[PDB]
Structure formats: C-alpha cells, structure tokens
Design a protein around this ligand. Structure first.
Ligand SMILES: [Cl-]
Ligand code: NA
Lengths: 395, 386
C-alpha cells in the first residue's frame, strides 16, 4: 500500500527507484519465539558458569534472567519504532538489499553510508538517525543517510548459495546501492567492525566513495614503526588488544573455520543464539548495553535467520593472510581518511598505527565508549561524522 | 556378571552400577529433538567435503534418525559389562571393568577423551570377552569416566580443576582396586595427557602407551611423513576452533549447546566425521551424543581446554617436566589429528615400543578395536616387569 513517510523522497538523479519496505514479522513467528524460549533447556551449574566476572563467558545467572525477561519481551513496539524510519530494498546481483534511509530535499546534500558489523545490524544506528531527524527536517537536512543491511543480515538476502562471497563482493554490492540512488558523483562511508573493512574497500577500490571515516582499524603494531613510544592510554590499548587476541577470539576462529557447524548449532534454539551473541554485547561495550537492546537484536537475528548467513567474512583470515588487511599497501587509503578512537574498542589503535594505513586527515579521541560506538555514544558518533564530512567534502 | 569379581587386595570395594535412564529423560530428549529448528540453506552448509563444518543435510538426516533412535537396546548393551562407582574426593567416579581370575593379572587403565567416553572402549572390551574367559584373561581392564563425563560427577563448582587433578583422581581408582604395585595406562586425546601425567608423577603407574602425542616438530622425508605434516597443519589451521572456544569461553559454549540436543549434535557430530579414519556409523554418534545429553556432560567436560590459554612456554608433551622416563609405547594411526612420526615421539619419553598402522584415525579403539587390543597386549607383554 502507498505510505507517505517523511524523509523518504528518493534523490533526484537516482537511476533505480527502490521498493519501499516495512518490517512485518508474522504473528505465528512471535508466538513461536515465546514457546521456544520457554522450553529451551539451561545448562546445570558449573564452575565456569558461576564466574560472575564473565572470565569464561556469560554466566548461568545472566542467561536464566535473560530467558525470563525474553518470555515477556514484546516485539511489536520495537517493530513500530523501526518502521518510523524510511526503509527500502533494491535487487542487486540477485540479492535483496535492505536499507534504512533519511533523504534530504537538498539537491546537493552530502550522501553518507553507515556500515554495521557482527553481531550488529542497522539497529545500531537508529539512535543516531533519531538525533538527525530531531535536528533537521527533510528540508534542512545536510546529508543523505543510508544504513544498509549487509548481505546475509536481517532483511537482506543471501549471500548466494552457489559461490563464495567475500568483503570485496560486499563492498561492490553496497556501492551499487549508492550508485542506484544517484550518488556516482560521490559519497562518504563510515564503518566499524566488519563495516570498517567494507568501508576501507569502498574507499580504496570504488570511485564513488570519496572519503571514509572508521572507528575500528584492526591491526597489530605495524612493521613500519621501529619504536616503542608508550603512554598510559597506549598501555591500556595494547593490553586490551592482547586480551582480545588471546581470550576473545574464539568466535573468530569458529566462524572462520567451521561456519556451517556453528550456524547449524545456533539455529536450533533462540537461547543458543542468545548465549553466543549476548557475550559480545556484554564484553565489547564501554557503556553498558541494556538487556532490552540485546534481546531486540537477538530477536531480529532469530526472526530473519541471520546468524548462519552472517559469518562468511570471518573465513577470509584462514589461513592467516600474508599481510593483515589494514597493514597491506593494497588497502592503504589514499582518499581523505578519518578515525575516531574509542578506548573500549576490541583492538584500540593509537594514531601513529592508524596513520600507517592511510591518508589520515581527521583524528578524534574519546574518553567514553567502546566497540558499539554509534549505539553506545550516538551523539559523540554523530558529532564526529558530521565534523568529518564538513571538513573533507569538496562539493 | 562374568569378569566382575573384585581383585583380591582391593582396599575399597566399589559400588555396583547400572544405567537406568528414566522414561521422562528419554521423552524430554525426544521433545527437544522435535522442537529443534533447522538452519536456512547456506553456501557453507552445502559443501559436501565439509570444508566449513557439517552439512545442513547431514544434520537434518541425523535429527530425523534420532527420532527413531531407541536408547533401551544401547543401554542394555552398556549394562552387559561390569560397572561400578567410587567416591573419590567428593566425586562419583564411574568405571567399566573386566576383572581376571588370575591373581597377578596385569592391571590396565584405558583413558578416553573429548567428545568421547567409556563407550569408545566397549568394542575392545567385547573383543576381550570374545578372546578370553575370566580364567584366561591376562589383565584387569579399567575404563573410567573422567570427572565431568557421563556418569562421573564434577568437576567441582567452587574451585578450578585441571589435568593433574584428573590424573590424581583416576590414579586413586587404581589404588582403590589394589593396584598400588603397578598398572599400565593407555590414552588418546586428553587421555594421552592424563596418561603422561600418571606415568610421570604417580608411583603406581609403571608404563604408558599413547595413540596421540600432540606436539610440534622438534628442532632436532617419506610420503607418509608428508601426509602427516599436512594433516597436522590442517588441524592447527582449520580444526582447532573448538579448542579456542572451549579454552576461553567454556561457559558461553556450554550454555549455548545445552539448550537443544541438536545444537550438541551439530558440535560433536563434526568431530566424529572429521577425526575418524574408519567411518563411524550414525548410530554410534547418536549413542554418544544421547549419553552426553542425559548426563549433562558437555558443559562439565571442557575444563581441560583452558590449560593452554595463555599458551605455555613449552607444549606439555615437549616439556622436560613431563618427559616419560618409564617404559613408553606409541601407536601411529594415520588419521590422528596430529600424526607424529617416531623421531618426534622419541623426544618426549623413553620410547621402547612403536607400532604403525595403515588404517584408523583419532578414535583408534572405537575404529580399530582388534588393532588396538593387539597393540595393548604386545605392549604390556613387552614392558610389564611383575
Ligand atoms: Cl560504526
Ligand atoms: Na549498516
């Protein structure tokens, strides 16, 4: 049905008109989820499950309380809030690509694509979009904001069943979203987690991406630095990165080597999926992420069968590459490159490290916030993004 | 039962044990099997060579077979072997045994690993009963459930527990049965680490035979050595996700796989498929996963893996602290996870016995029970000194 929605006017110059989209999870799926949560079995007490500091992952107590809360969680109000933002799909290379958008009425608005990672989604950016639409009407909005679901995530289909699919394919398909909307003349990319790899690939390989801002730059100490110049904050950063490599990367190895096994396993029960993903919302955040937010994201993954389709990126590091992606001259960013440092990112990277990976024209450090920067610190994230775009955009 | 006479000289009489899973447990399992949901089709799940793990098709077929799986015949077969428990350090320790009538029979403990159990050794025990009567049996055979596995309780809720604790407790099973004068240990998988610890640190263990020796190449070539190195590299690169996850986030994965029996089946089935040389029948996989489910084994069973996080200076097998000075034997099965040539294994102990096989993989006793028994007999006869 025709549905007028503010901020939904397709930019002049779009070559393909996207199909309007709204989320409508069926009643039977909602009923079913309540049943499957209720009847899920819980592990018995173990030494590891009783460690309240989560040294061995989620606690039994956390999971039992989350299961109880989930019984009464109501998807419909969350769905209504999602549907207050314009959403669309395109058909690109046989994939359905879902995206959220805020479109300006200004002919020369700055186009921006925001790129989520794993185990996130477009949901990570809705607080940011809320701030944007409260500050700007469609007529005063300086930007077009496009928040796509990566292939394999939520309402995006795929990846294909008959061919391998990697980060370069992801970037090519996301670039086509922006080209379809008429942004061949240029757009800015922003990414964290896997989205930071996609954003780097867009900036390095695709003409339409003119600049990129990242809040993650996964790398070791670059070989081109001969020194050890070491400050207290640099101490915390190296310690957290070392914690992540030794104790925090089980999911990377499992996703990267046996994605079919873990995808089959976590499809069986929503509480299996909650265990796996909840650990990351708890451990990776600087600002505590509310249980309701965790349940919302895991519920969305459950309804859309996201998890088994979402982990294809991880195998690109098996066997270990000759050079890490960020440390490879093949992927050095020559275009204007910005970075924001959040101290509880998984691998917090000092400026001197990041500078070895591209033409770093913008640097902003923060005192608060971790891996889920937009979700945890939406206004800090937005202030960085708009400052970067206004600094680098050349019309 | 034949072979159930407790050896004379046992200092603690073990309590007889039988498996009797309740109808309620069986029907709870079938409920949750039927409730389980399948993955959507994915590229990774369509790879018939299992390069990314189990196929979606294998799991769907295995789930369907599970709905027709009857636990009671399997349970009856288990209960056809003498079984017992001891209370050791506040743990219930289950074990299967065949006891000889010969006063000076050679005692042997057979040590399972993960995701195995005493079930792995029942074909060997069957071979033993086919070959010997209680009067002619040369050995006392003890097959314990490690702490945290199937009918053994624990590990403790309030303190950490490691391989040295495991060996201390298992040694006490043998001491309780009167074997302080000596016994032989045999191990694969984590059982090979337990067997090494027994031989190095415990007086009553007089010799040890291993069918795994997890190590890198010592700093000090045939086509077989080439295939061995390639398999070891495959295991290190693509086969060790479960090690990192078990070793760093055991509570997360223990909680996740406890929610659904089909989650557990996915995780464990992959290993019975990839680790075997001889194809392991689906029924055998279902029996093992079913037993793990009824006994809530999985979250209790993975405590060993965190011992290598952070990675120690030297691998356990390569550490002089764990060099085996007592008589040490090794059997090479080509589809072991890290197949180790003789010159490698020899650096880790007083290797007096070597046997190579053309067939068989990681689950040597389960896959090749006659070869396993032949090796065990040959080793014990060579090294036992009264
Ligand atoms: Cl981001
Ligand atoms: Na996104």
């Amino acid at each position: 049905a025709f549905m007028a929605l503010a901020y939904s006017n397709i930019p002049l110059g779009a070559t393909v008109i996207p199909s309007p989209f709204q989320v409508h999870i069926s009643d039977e799926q909602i009923e079913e989820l309540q049943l499957l949560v209720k009847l899920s079995k819980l592990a018995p007490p173990t030494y590891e499950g009783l460690q309240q500091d989560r040294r061995y992952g989620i606690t039994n107590e956390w999971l039992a309380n989350a299961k109880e809360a989930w019984k009464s969680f109501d998807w419909r109000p969350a769905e209504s809030r999602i549907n207050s933002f314009p959403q669309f799909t395109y058909d690109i290379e046989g994939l359905t690509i879902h995206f959220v958008a805020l479109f300006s009425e200004k002919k020369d608005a700055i186009p921006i694509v925001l790129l989520h990672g794993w185990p996130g989604s477009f949901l990570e950016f809705l607080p940011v979009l809320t701030s944007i639409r409260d500050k700007y009407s469609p007529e005063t909005l300086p930007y077009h904001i496009v928040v796509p679901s990566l292939p394999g995530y939520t309402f995006s289909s795929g990846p294909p069943l008959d061919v391998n699919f990697n980060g370069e394919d992801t970037a090519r398909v996301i670039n086509k979203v922006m080209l379809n909307l008429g942004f061949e003349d240029g757009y800015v990319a922003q990414g964290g987690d896997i989205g930071s790899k996609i954003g780097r690939i867009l900036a390095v390989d695709h003409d339409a991406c003119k600049a990129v801002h990242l809040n993650a730059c996964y790398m070791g100490k670059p070989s081109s630095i001969p020194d050890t110049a070491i400050t207290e904050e640099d101490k915390r950063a190296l310690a957290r990165a070392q914690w992540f490599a030794t104790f925090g990367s089980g999911y990377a190895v499992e996703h990267g080597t046996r994605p079919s096994t873990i995808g089959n396993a976590l499809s069986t029960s929503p509480v299996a999926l909650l265990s796996w993903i909840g650990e990351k919302f708890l451990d990776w955040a600087g600002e505590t992420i509310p249980l309701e937010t965790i349940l919302e994201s895991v519920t969305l993954y459950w309804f859309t069968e996201t998890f088994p389709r979402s982990i294809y990126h991880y195998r690109e590091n098996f066997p270990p590459p000759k050079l890490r992606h960020t440390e490879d001259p093949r992927w050095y960013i020559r275009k204007p490159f910005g970075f924001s440092y959040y101290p509880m990112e998984l691998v917090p990277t000092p400026r001197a490290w990041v500078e070895t990976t591209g033409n770093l024209v913008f640097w902003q450090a923060h005192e608060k916030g971790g891996h889920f920067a937009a979700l945890e610190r939406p206004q800090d994230y937005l202030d960085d993004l708009t400052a970067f775009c206004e600094q680098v955009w050349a019309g």
